[PDB]
Amino acid sequence: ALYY
Amino acid sequence: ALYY
Amino acid sequence: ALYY
Amino acid sequence: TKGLVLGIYSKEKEEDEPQFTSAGENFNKLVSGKLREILNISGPPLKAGKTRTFYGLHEDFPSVVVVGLGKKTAGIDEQENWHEGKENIRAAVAAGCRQIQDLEIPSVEVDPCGDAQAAAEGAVLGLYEYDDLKQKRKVVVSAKLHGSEDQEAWQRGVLFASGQNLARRLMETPANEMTPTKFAEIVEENLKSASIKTDVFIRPKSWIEEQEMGSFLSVAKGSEEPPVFLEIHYKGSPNASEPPLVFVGKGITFDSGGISIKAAANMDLMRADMGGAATICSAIVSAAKLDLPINIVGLAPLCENMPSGKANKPGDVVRARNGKTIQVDNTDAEGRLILADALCYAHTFNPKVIINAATLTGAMDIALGSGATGVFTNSSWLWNKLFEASIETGDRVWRMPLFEHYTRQVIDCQLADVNNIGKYRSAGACTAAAFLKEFVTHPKWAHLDIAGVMTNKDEVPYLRKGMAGRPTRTLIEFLFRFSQE
Amino acid sequence: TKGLVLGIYSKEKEEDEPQFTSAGENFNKLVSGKLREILNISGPPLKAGKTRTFYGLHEDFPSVVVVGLGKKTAGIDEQENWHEGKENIRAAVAAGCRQIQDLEIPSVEVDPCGDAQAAAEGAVLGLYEYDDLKQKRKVVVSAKLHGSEDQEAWQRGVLFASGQNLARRLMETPANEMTPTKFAEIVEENLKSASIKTDVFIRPKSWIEEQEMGSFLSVAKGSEEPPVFLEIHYKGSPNASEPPLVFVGKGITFDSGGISIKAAANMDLMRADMGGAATICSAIVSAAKLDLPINIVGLAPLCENMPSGKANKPGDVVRARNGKTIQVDNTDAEGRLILADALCYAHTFNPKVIINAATLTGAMDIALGSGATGVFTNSSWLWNKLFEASIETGDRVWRMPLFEHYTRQVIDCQLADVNNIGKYRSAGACTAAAFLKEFVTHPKWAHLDIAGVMTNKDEVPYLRKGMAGRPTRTLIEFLFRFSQE
Amino acid sequence: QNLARRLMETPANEMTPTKFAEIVEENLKSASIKTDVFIRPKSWIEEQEMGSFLSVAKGSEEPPVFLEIHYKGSPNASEPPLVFVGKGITFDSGGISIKAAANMDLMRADMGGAATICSAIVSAAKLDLPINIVGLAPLCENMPSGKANKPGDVVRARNGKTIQVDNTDAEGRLILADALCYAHTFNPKVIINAATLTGAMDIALGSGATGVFTNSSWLWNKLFEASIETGDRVWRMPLFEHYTRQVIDCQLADVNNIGKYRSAGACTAAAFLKEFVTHPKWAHLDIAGVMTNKDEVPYLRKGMAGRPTRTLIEFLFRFSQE
Numbered sequence A, B, C: 001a002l003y004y
Numbered sequence D, E: 001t002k003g004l005v006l007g008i009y010s011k012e013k014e015e016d017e018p019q020f021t022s023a024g025e026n027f028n029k030l031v032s033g034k035l036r037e038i039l040n041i042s043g044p045p046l047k048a049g050k051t052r053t054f055y056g057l058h059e060d061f062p063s064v065v066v067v068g069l070g071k072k073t074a075g076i077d078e079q080e081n082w083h084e085g086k087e088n089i090r091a092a093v094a095a096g097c098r099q100i101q102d103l104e105i106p107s108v109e110v111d112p113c114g115d116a117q118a119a120a121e122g123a124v125l126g127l128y129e130y131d132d133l134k135q136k137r138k139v140v141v142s143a144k145l146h147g148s149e150d151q152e153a154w155q156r157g158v159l160f161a162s163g164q165n166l167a168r169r170l171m172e173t174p175a176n177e178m179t180p181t182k183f184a185e186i187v188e189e190n191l192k193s194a195s196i197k198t199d200v201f202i203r204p205k206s207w208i209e210e211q212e213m214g215s216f217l218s219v220a221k222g223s224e225e226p227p228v229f230l231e232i233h234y235k236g237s238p239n240a241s242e243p244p245l246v247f248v249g250k251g252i253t254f255d256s257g258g259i260s261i262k263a264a265a266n267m268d269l270m271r272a273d274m275g276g277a278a279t280i281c282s283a284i285v286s287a288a289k290l291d292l293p294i295n296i297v298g299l300a301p302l303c304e305n306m307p308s309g310k311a312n313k314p315g316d317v318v319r320a321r322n323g324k325t326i327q328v329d330n331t332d333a334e335g336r337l338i339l340a341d342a343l344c345y346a347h348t349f350n351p352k353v354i355i356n357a358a359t360l361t362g363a364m365d366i367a368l369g370s371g372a373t374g375v376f377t378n379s380s381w382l383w384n385k386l387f388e389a390s391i392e393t394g395d396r397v398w399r400m401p402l403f404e405h406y407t408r409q410v411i412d413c414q415l416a417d418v419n420n421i422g423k424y425r426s427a428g429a430c431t432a433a434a435f436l437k438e439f440v441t442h443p444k445w446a447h448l449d450i451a452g453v454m455t456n457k458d459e460v461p462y463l464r465k466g467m468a469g470r471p472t473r474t475l476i477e478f479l480f481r482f483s484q485e
Numbered sequence F: 001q002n003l004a005r006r007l008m009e010t011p012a013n014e015m016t017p018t019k020f021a022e023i024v025e026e027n028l029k030s031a032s033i034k035t036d037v038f039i040r041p042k043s044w045i046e047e048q049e050m051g052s053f054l055s056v057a058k059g060s061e062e063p064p065v066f067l068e069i070h071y072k073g074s075p076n077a078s079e080p081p082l083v084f085v086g087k088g089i090t091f092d093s094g095g096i097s098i099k100a101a102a103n104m105d106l107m108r109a110d111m112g113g114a115a116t117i118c119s120a121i122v123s124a125a126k127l128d129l130p131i132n133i134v135g136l137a138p139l140c141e142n143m144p145s146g147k148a149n150k151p152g153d154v155v156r157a158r159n160g161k162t163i164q165v166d167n168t169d170a171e172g173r174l175i176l177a178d179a180l181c182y183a184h185t186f187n188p189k190v191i192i193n194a195a196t197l198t199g200a201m202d203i204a205l206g207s208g209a210t211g212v213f214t215n216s217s218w219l220w221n222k223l224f225e226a227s228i229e230t231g232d233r234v235w236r237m238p239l240f241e242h243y244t245r246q247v248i249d250c251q252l253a254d255v256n257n258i259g260k261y262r263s264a265g266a267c268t269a270a271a272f273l274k275e276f277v278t279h280p281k282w283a284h285l286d287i288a289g290v291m292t293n294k295d296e297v298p299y300l301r302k303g304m305a306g307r308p309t310r311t312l313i314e315f316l317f318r319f320s321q322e
Ligand SMILES: *C(=O)[C@@H](O)[C@H](N)CCCCCCC
Pocket: A001, A002, F092, F106, F110, F169, F170, F171, F172, F196, F197, F198, F199, F202, F288, F289, F291
């Protein structure tokens, strides 16, 4: 998952 | 459609 | 400080 | 055992105290003045859309929520282009019903507040939530008119709100459930429940190919989900040969952008890229429920827009049903591609009017946000009919320009007759409308870009957060007035 | 004429009905059972943090808000590292007080709910809003203990909450008002009002230069706003020569990033880049208000970080007070520059402990968000004291690592002894902490990166949206326990 | 650890779900005959109603497998096992929520969770540890295509909870939901999962230490003590309802697969996993920050690190002695  |  |  | 929602107006300068509606004053009489007494004790007056809850006033209504209706005589506000009184009622009744629901009360009776249709709209729109997929849900609330005098207007409000809620359901549902096929099946069952004077054709890929809809096919092919072309007929006119009104809706069931792929952020909202199809189909279902004495055809090209090893590639040239070639410079301008073919097909019905709706451009959201649906039309008669309908419903429309200035920026095209994205970033909703106009010869056509009204946060007080199903009620009101003429 | 907030617990399996607090049960007695009767009629039980309002129960309390306190016996929750009962009370009382305020009632009495300090914290934190600059404001609410038995604990809660609200005020105020000079003057007046055993020195640029604070000066110079070095003494020990505890806070009154300029989006929140100074200064004010028998020194370098024709340029090399050279590769890593010089100065006091706080890194917000303040410390004794204090206050802390692994990434430096931004994006809060550690020789030092706890949306139920002033109360509790030992 | 490094470094067109399962199978079987391996196919995954895992795998033409490995080391065959679970995304493109090009090749190591837990079990078998251990690794690719997960889609996990897939690149928590559910069917003594789960973990602690989220301080302390000996450090990160609230706040479904905010990404990812766990001794290890070494660990050359394999082995060894 990336942030964001 | 996006801009742009 | 930012990343990055 | 039930909850009760009652209205109170703001105090006028000449009144000694704020006035209840008829139903509020009668309930106060029934409880020997205890409602007015407790409202007085509770402190400051209730302003428009505000609520206050009183317990134990009557054995049959353990919870009574009084709601502020604002100025009794609020009518058309020329600075807002709507009927303010109706908007006050929808907001206040929605707020009262939410409070009853939070108390876990399954049944509520609602003050007609001098306009039972607006009251019903506030309750039915206000309570709606799409929660089919959640284990934890709010109590299901059954709202009914308080009293037996305003029944037709109350049910008319229920019908209008239910039409919009159908569109909200269709828009909110995740796209892996709401496929082109599923959408078509749900609209079919709703239309058929509404009237037997109805035909529905869920036209498959083979029919789309036979109809030479190359522009629509080029969008659908990237995805493994089968496309359908939904065609719905409502035969309400007493004369079977009376030319129909034709509605067209963009039914992109999920828009990833395709090879011109969208950024990740909030891309989930693109499950509502079939909102054009949802609102026009829902309006037709409601027209059928209303028995309107008019012939109506609904057309909705439905497919996904996905990247893959067979998807539209930037620069590709596709042939629309009318034989015009389109250079697909941006695969995320896919709504105008599918509409080109549906608009062409629309002309084959000899329609009286052609109205299309589409969640078409980000530029429309930048232009007017959720304040109003943008309407591009070659007919000021048609503009004015939609505008007048919108005043009544409160679901506002705002005219946007069809000028050759924008046309010139889409027919300036390296490979083909028209380019599917403008030469410049400016006026994206206007050049999108100009592209559509290249597929229209009809003298009473309106294009509604509803991208800005696709969702609600808190702007419309009587819609909870989520897909908005706007401007379904304005379309219904337009059809109703057209049928009376 | 006043409002009243009363608690009720969740029903235990062996009880026939949910139990009031002592104050709720006594009020119910006073109104001949009408409170229990109306609560029963009103429907479902009140769960933790939920509220319900009853009108006209008693001539002196036209509005009574009952608030759900959760499980009576809720104590330390080992899965949340806090005292759950106290957190339930703060949330419920805040919710009750907000409801009284919405009814425009200027006076409220508050059930101590079996822990008057937590109740006072919920009310005082819960009601706080920074609205000095707005024409339209909520009614000012005066909250007081209901009853006369728990007064010291009630006032202790008021004092703790007021210390945090001071920090919130200092953080929220716009930076064109809250300049280095203004911040220093407001802390001065608050500290002096708290105790006469206090010295305050608002040290000017000339003193900063005399103290060879080249790293701090390099940040301040881009802006035309004069820098100050705030030094505050609270002489609470009975022995004047007892070594002090020293607190240090980053006081960047506005952070634009400087030449390494920040993006526009939400840059206004950088008015709170003096939150480190705000929380440590506020904690010292509260310690003085508490008369704690300890010597404390507070140090806060205050300046703006702005781009201009005299600002820090990437690559510049500056000399810290301790003689170490720093390569300023990123001018938006300015907090560690000003802290280098303040931390050096901190050692001159012969302190028992050195604790610094700073809104230091975006990486800290990515790491733990607003769940807890990140604590980097070379002393597990000191970690455990801060952790234990945090359990009581509910304003949680979470330990983060000081390892030479991160040090190696900041002393790897092309031009100078240490680089002010790491060689890599990874672990930004940890390499920032390692940079600070190069300016510390003391064996009991803790660095608190409070960037993630700078604001509240809704995460802490008893703080309205805005600057949070966290973790002021945990610092106060730490000082209080240290003084008792 | 080198086995895990091999499994992580190998290019994803070679290290497919099937190939990974076959290599772990041969290593485990070489280690001990007291071993069963089931390379469970798509049909079994479907029978097991693992809708969340299936939704990730379907975008790619590469067949998914659910690797289940048993090491029967206890003298009592009925002794409840320790269960390890590893995220086995053999390549993560992000899917429709597609990643940027830069350094995307490192996503061949998005099966590092499966690599480290499987390798630790192989080593436990080589050590003859007198304990029963089960390893579970959902393996698939995450690719964009005309059948991939679409943002907003809602999928049903094995436990019946619905998940709104707002970001298709938060796929590790989707596949772990179903594997964690399955883990409970073994009556385990402990459940430990590992995953290269979030960029936020790398921003939080980098390669200094693996982030450990656990509902058991006993379990934290055992992993921490093991890590002191191995030098392959762990660092505790919080499981608080504060983060849970940000994932169960969900427009369409029971839980949302990405938080409402950017903040604390590793913590909200851990909170999402916790919605699929009822067991009282569970630990989630987010190893995204320790996936690679440049020069930080002096005794690992540049490349995939296979951390924290040795800390897991040391933990199992001490647990077996008690
Ligand atoms: C979320 O995007 C996860 O699915 C990714 N596997 C996280 C990868 C983070 C890598 C950071 C270290 C290079």
